């Protein structure tokens, strides 16, 4: 393409460079996702 700087202009958005799948369904799934974490994240006898 001919856009050397032009394709960069919009990347002033809050990004991490976009290398990570960002959860859109919940913010409590942002860091510690339940699937793996529940083994250690919490130690409960049952729901």
């Amino acid at each position: 393409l001919s856009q050397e700087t032009f394709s960069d202009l919009w990347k002033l958005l809050p990004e991490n460079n976009v290398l990570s799948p960002l959860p859109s369904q919940a913010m409590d799934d942002l860091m510690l996702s339940p699937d793996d974490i529940e083994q250690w994240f919490t130690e409960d006898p049952g729901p």
Partner: protein
């Protein structure tokens, strides 16, 4: 259904380690306590972003150490119904 529901801590980024160490430290002191997922994760999210590179890099460094430890066990790990 990859599963692997018995993995180690993980290769999680420093971001999750921030929540990880904080949520755990509280749970270690208080075995009677837990946290609210939506609450604690949001508080950590906002707080993390506003921290300095020194602090973020600290969690990043710890993550690197756990990542390598993960790799070590990863080789000796057999995926249960790991499709």
């Amino acid at each position: 259904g990859k599963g692997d529901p018995k993995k180690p801590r993980g290769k999680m980024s420093s971001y999750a380690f921030f929540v990880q160490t904080c949520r755990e430290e509280h749970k270690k002191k208080h075995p009677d306590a837990s946290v609210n997922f939506s609450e604690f994760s949001k508080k950590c999210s906002e707080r993390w972003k506003t921290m300095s590179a020194k602090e973020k890099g600290k969690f990043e460094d710890m993550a690197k150490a756990d990542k390598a430890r993960y790799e070590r066990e990863m080789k000796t790990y057999i995926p249960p119904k790991g499709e």
